[PDB]
């Protein structure tokens, strides 16, 4: 086509989606990670995660308002990944890298799994 | 913070949100523009438009499944802007620029209004 493109549009959209999440506006699901609960938008979770994409395209699970993750999932690792979904920024630290990588593998977030593998390899 | 950032994350999110729109997955509103209907996600519309942001934060309108736009709104101009919301690409042409700018003014999409004003000024 002969379209023009606004460079900052995708980033501006994601910033506003994070503002709606922070104010709990039109969030339609709560993700339960052991004792912890995280409110989010199903569409953003699907857009970022192979696991959530599979869950919310399922004809029965698409209608659930609560999703319980596997008890081995670390709430902090999930929190870091949820923040990444809504911001593009990943708070990867020596103290959380193992939990973040395991959570990213479970959530099927391949780019995160890739940077975790590389950061771990450099420390070996 | 000491976060790392994935450059293509926002664009990849928007691409997947457009794929969900194309397959009519988790769309939660229909925008009526005279004889034409457009299915979308309320969160994406709010993230792109000052008008939709105001509509869907209203305590009664937030729950509507159908929104009727002003009868002066051109369906093609709306279609072009909805495509822009989900892709960052604007199909701006001599034959549609007036309708696109008027629709962008109504929808409160300031960056679109700005490029339309500039493209019109160059042709004068």
């Amino acid at each position: 086509d002969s379209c023009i493109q606004f460079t900052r549009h995708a980033s501006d959209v994601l910033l506003n989606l994070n503002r709606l999440r922070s104010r709990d506006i039109l969030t339609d699901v709560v993700i339960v990670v052991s004792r912890e609960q995280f409110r989010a938008h199903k569409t953003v979770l699907m857009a970022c995660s192979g696991l959530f994409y599979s869950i919310f395209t399922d004809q029965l699970k698409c209608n659930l308002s609560v999703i319980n993750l596997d008890p081995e999932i670390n709430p902090e690792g999930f929190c870091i990944l949820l923040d990444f979904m809504y911001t593009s920024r990943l708070n990867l630290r020596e103290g959380n890298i193992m939990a973040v990588m395991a959570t990213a593998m479970y959530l099927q977030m391949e780019h995160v799994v890739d940077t975790c593998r590389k950061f771990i390899k450099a420390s070996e | 913070d000491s976060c790392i950032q994935f450059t293509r994350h926002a664009s990849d999110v928007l691409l997947n949100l457009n794929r969900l729109r194309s397959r009519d997955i988790l769309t939660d509103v229909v925008i009526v523009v005279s004889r034409e209907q457009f299915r979308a996600h309320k969160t994406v519309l709010m993230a792109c438009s000052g008008l939709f942001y105001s509509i869907f934060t209203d305590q009664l309108k937030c729950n509507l499944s159908v929104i009727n736009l002003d009868p002066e709104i051109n369906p093609e101009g709306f279609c072009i802007l909805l495509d822009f919301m989900y892709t960052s690409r604007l199909n701006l042409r001599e034959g549609n620029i007036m309708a696109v700018m008027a629709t962008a003014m109504y929808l409160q999409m300031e960056h679109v209004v700005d490029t339309c004003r500039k493209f019109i000024k160059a042709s004068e």
Partner: peptide, 4 residues
């Protein structure tokens, strides 16, 4: 705005 750019030519993509």
């Amino acid at each position: 705005w750019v030519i993509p």
